[PDB]
């Protein structure tokens, strides 16, 4: 991004850049974050089999949104719903709800004293 | 095979000409690698046509190079069932080069006293639709115009295509489904 990636064959550099961008876009989750997450948020089941597959292998509790082509068994917490769009994926998992917002008022006496701003 | 389409290259001009139809005529007239003789073989031929008629030097040349010249070619394909053919339309560049090649093979065995007389007489002879490659142009185009009624392994291809999205008609194909 500074421009410091130049080579006398521009093709070898711009082609590494396109593929670097795909890494940035794919990894952007764990990229800026301090280590393995304390929950794993799987929105889809239908094609993203792997995200659930690895969560069971690391033992990390699962927070799941299941559709009518997926079972609610074998994951620890569910929203009954559908996998697409904003119909179940941030309609309870945002500031409009009260239940993702009363959990967070219980963080304010355990590891912090104030942290409620950060989160939706 | 082939990972990509690849076209023709640049061809350089010759020390006696700046016209292309002349430079491409000397080129496939080239044998032993030595064009610098073929320059003269083209210009000595063209003067003899020009004495036969003075309206042009090009009189017999331009229609011989149309008349002995094909338009279509037929390949033979079969991997099962029965024997079939697939006609293709080909490029002007190869239509022209079959025709010029056949003019220079036919004229060099024509056995007259100068290569200049031999070529002016063999273009004069094909110009009037009665030379030696009129037969070759007529047979080859007949076979490609005729085998348009066939396609590679037709009998299984007719069921195979409509199952995997395709047409219910009868069509030629490049070694695949129809």
């Amino acid at each position: 991004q500074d421009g410091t990636f130049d080579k006398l064959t521009k093709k070898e550099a711009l082609m590494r850049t396109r593929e670097l961008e795909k890494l940035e876009n794919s990894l952007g989750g764990i990229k800026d974050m301090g280590g393995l997450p304390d929950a794993l948020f799987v929105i889809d089941a239908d094609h993203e089999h792997i995200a659930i597959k690895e969560a069971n292998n690391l033992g990390i509790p699962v927070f799941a949104i299941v559709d009518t082509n997926s079972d609610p068994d074998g994951v620890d917490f569910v929203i009954p719903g559908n996998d697409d769009a904003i119909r179940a994926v941030t309609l309870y998992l945002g500031a409009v709800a009260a239940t993702v917002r009363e959990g967070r008022s219980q963080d304010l006496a355990s590891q912090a004293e104030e942290s409620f701003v950060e989160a939706e | 095979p082939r990972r990509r389409v690849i076209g023709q290259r640049k061809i350089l001009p010759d020390p006696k000409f700046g016209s292309e139809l002349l430079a491409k005529f000397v080129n496939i007239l080239m044998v032993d690698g030595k064009k610098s003789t073929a320059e003269s073989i083209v210009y000595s031929a063209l003067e003899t046509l020009a004495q036969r008629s003075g309206k042009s030097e090009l009189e017999a040349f331009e229609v011989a190079l149309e008349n002995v010249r094909p338009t279509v070619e037929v390949k033979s394909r079969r991997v099962g069932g029965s024997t079939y053919q697939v006609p293709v339309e080909v490029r002007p560049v190869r239509r022209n080069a079959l025709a010029m090649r056949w003019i220079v093979e036919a004229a060099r065995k024509r056995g007259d006293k100068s290569m200049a007389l031999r070529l002016a007489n063999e273009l004069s002879d094909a110009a009037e639709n009665k030379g030696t490659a009129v037969k070759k142009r007529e047979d080859v185009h007949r076979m490609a115009e005729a085998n348009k009624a066939f396609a590679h392994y037709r009998w299984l291809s007719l069921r195979s295509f409509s199952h995997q999205a395709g047409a219910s008609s009868k069509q030629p194909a490049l070694g695949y489904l129809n």
Binding site: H47 | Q164, A165, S168
Partner: protein, 70 residues
């Protein structure tokens, strides 16, 4: 099979590739089959079997969009 009536967007040749479905549908659609009274249920009559491949072909159209190959 050419059919008496004409196809949609019509021309002066009648053809069966546009408005036939029941003609020679078991009369000559057969290959060397002999006189039988129960063998067709598993030899000949493969409608359950053949429906699956077609279903699979309709299934793959959704799934290419869903991976965003388009």
């Amino acid at each position: 099979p050419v059919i008496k009536v004409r196809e949609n967007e019509p021309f002066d040749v009648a053809l069966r590739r546009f408005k036939r479905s029941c003609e020679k549908a078991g009369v000559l659609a057969e290959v060397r089959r002999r006189e039988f009274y129960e063998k067709p249920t598993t030899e000949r009559k493969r409608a359950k079997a053949s429906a699956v491949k077609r279903h699979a072909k309709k299934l793959a159209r959704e799934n290419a969009r869903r991976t965003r190959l388009y």
